[PDB]
Design a protein around this nucleic acid. Structure first.
Ligand SMILES: [Mg+2]
Ligand SMILES: [Mg+2]
Ligand SMILES: [Mg+2]
Ligand SMILES: [Mg+2]
Ligand SMILES: [Mg+2]
Ligand SMILES: [Mg+2]
Ligand SMILES: [Mg+2]
Ligand SMILES: [Mg+2]
Ligand SMILES: [Mg+2]
Ligand SMILES: [Mg+2]
Ligand SMILES: [Mg+2]
Ligand SMILES: [Mg+2]
Ligand SMILES: [Mg+2]
Lengths: 49, 115, 100
RNA sequence: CUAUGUAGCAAAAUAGUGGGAAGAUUUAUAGGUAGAGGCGACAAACCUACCGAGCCUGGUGAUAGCUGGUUGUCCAAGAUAGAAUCUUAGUUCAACUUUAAAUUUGCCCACAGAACCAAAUCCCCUUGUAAAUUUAACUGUUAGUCCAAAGAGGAACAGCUCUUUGGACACUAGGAAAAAACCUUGUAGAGAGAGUAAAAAAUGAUCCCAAACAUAUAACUGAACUCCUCACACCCAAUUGGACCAAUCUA
RNA sequence: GACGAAGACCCUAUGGAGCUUUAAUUUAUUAAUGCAAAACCUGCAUUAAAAAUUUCGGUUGGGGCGACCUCGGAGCAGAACCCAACCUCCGAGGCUAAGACUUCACCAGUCAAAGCGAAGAUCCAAUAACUUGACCAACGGAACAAGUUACCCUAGGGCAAUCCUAUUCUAGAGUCCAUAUCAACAAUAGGGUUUACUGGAUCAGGACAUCCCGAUGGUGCAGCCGCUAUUAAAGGUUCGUUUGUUCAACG
């Protein structure tokens, strides 16, 4: 029902963390915190886990 | 289970019938208790072995003196069935720095000088 | 599990020390006693712990309590227990630093 | 098949009664098959008296959470929470125990205090006490029995499994007949001294089971408890500390 | 009679040796092929047989069958903490930092003022990485191992809920009537019920709750005998067919 996916950022790359998403939902994007620059950036999924 | 016993205070209330039965008096009570052990600590719970070890009553009869203040009575109300308490009587007053080495305690509980 | 008092009345509790671990709200927080997410009570300010009985006036934001108090007769009140820490030391002192 | 014999005459025999006895018979002589192998009219039968796997030497002082043992004198502290484990016949950690060392509080404990849904318990000022915590260093015990009590299981029984509070035992001594578990009692030696503690019954199957006693004043008897004269380290298991030392060799 | 001086049966061991396999791991050896090597051998791979090494988790009706095995919530555990269950009823698989709590060890686990910034273990492999997963659910986890030993060997351990029977109220009956008989339930007494989810011969000692013989009461026996009741343990208490949880039937 739910899948853990490694979400990665765009600006200040290299971040990786397994967040949750309902499998019935499409590809996910969020606005959250990048600590390399400590700013709000759009994070997007890359590959399901 | 088996537990410590909290004696109701109602028992420790001398009556007008008890007062003339023992040589005592409500007013002007007595300074010191002379206490002796007449029963074994063995076969009794540890919270009585320790009390007896604390009041100096380790040996058998071997009388020993204690204050008549509630801090000690609370201890004697736990071991009241393994001891005899009598009131020390001083019909000649406390001895002086002379007559300390010539005192004597009679079986009636009176401390006296020079036998 | 050990969900009971861990600092009893008249005990010297420093900052952050847990006063009581509980399941339900047996002991509500009082003066200088903070609550955690698990309802643990901990001592915010160094001092001496006391327990008291006070009147209960729940948050209106809460619902399971704001309505029960609405079901009580005239002259009624919900009393409940609280655990406070009377602070011991003062906040600070002033000392000579420079004589210019 | 029976009897004798059972360290016997014999580590399988003797006496009788029996099956075969010109055959797939029986037998002397030399040779062959060799051990996870041989041989087997398969019975796990036999391979030098003991073969579901010979015997000897070596690896080998195999390994053994199992059984059995473990050697001079004397003294002292010293016992039944628990957790995990191809684990409950054992180990490791903890708890308890011991020694040495540092420091200052430890135990008992009234008043106050601990929730909405009976016993008691927890916590501390004082008080009686002198112990407790900490550090350094090791071993040993560990899932015990009975009795009083409150519960759960089997009736509220089966002398029943289990949890909890306490006591005793595995330590001395006296009593209830004998008696680990009930009652009395602890710190230890000598005495041809003394005082006590507990402690006596009322009104089915070998052979009953102390003997007796209705009425002379309630006191006495009774310990390693206590006192007395003298002397003192001189009555626990596992474990731990200490003081001595027999005999031999050497300087 | 001195539990008088070999052989069995039950349980245990992370003992041993096996047997079978559709239990795990292997193809080293052989046989087929297939591919390279100069008509045969050498090397590699796949498939099979033949073997080879290896293991048999835990709590339990009565051992087996069958369940469960980690974590969480309610009574036992009435009032700080803790306390068992194959006892009782159900589900789950932002960074930094004073102080503390804890599932009685450890390993894990839990709360958190201020301050700065935004609003189910270890090992292994793939990995630049930021770190990552399944199994480990026998849930403190051997990386991968089952069924079974009637041929087995060694070390070792070994005051009855439901009921049977007699006495109490007679109350129900008995052609009239409780007592001439059963005497229902119950109560008071003495005695057992283990499986499912050891006789015979020989010699017998003893009790009486007496089968006979002996003594006595009543009778509805008008009488021997019958019936019940009291007393009585000196004596006696058969031979056979069929069969051997041991009785039962039959002459
Ligand atoms: Mg050995
Ligand atoms: Mg073992
Ligand atoms: Mg000693
Ligand atoms: Mg206090
Ligand atoms: Mg003595
Ligand atoms: Mg084992
Ligand atoms: Mg084995
Ligand atoms: Mg529970
Ligand atoms: Mg537990
Ligand atoms: Mg812990
Ligand atoms: Mg903050
Ligand atoms: Mg396991
Ligand atoms: Mg486990």
């Amino acid at each position: 029902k739910n899948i853990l996916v490694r979400m990665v950022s765009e600006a200040g790359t290299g971040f990786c963390f397994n967040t949750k998403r309902n499998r019935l939902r499409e590809k996910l994007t969020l606005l959250h915190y990048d600590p390399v620059v400590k700013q709000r950036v759009l994070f997007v999924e890359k590959k399901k886990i | 289970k088996f537990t410590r016993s909290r004696i109701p205070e109602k028992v420790f209330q001398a009556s007008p019938e008890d007062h003339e039965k023992y040589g005592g008096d409500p007013q002007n009570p007595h300074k010191l208790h002379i206490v002796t052990r007449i029963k074994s600590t063995r076969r009794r719970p540890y919270w009585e072995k320790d009390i007896i070890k604390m009041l100096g009553l380790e040996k058998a009869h071997t009388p020993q003196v204690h204050k008549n203040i509630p801090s000690v009575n609370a201890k004697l109300k736990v071991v009241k069935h393994l001891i005899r308490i009598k009131p020390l009587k001083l019909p000649q007053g406390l001895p002086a720095e002379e007559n300390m080495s010539n005192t004597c305690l009679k079986s009636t509980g009176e401390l006296v000088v020079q036998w | 599990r050990r969900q009971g008092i861990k600092k009893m009345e008249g005990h010297y509790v420093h900052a952050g020390n847990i006063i009581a671990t509980q399941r339900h709200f047996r002991w509500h927080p009082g003066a200088h006693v903070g609550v955690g997410k698990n309802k643990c009570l901990y001592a915010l300010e160094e001092g001496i712990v006391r327990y008291t009985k006070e009147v209960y006036v729940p948050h209106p934001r809460n619902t399971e309590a704001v309505d029960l108090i609405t079901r009580l007769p005239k002259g009624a009140v919900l009393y409940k227990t609280f655990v406070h820490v009377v602070p011991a030391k003062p906040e600070g002192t002033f000392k000579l630093v420079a004589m210019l």
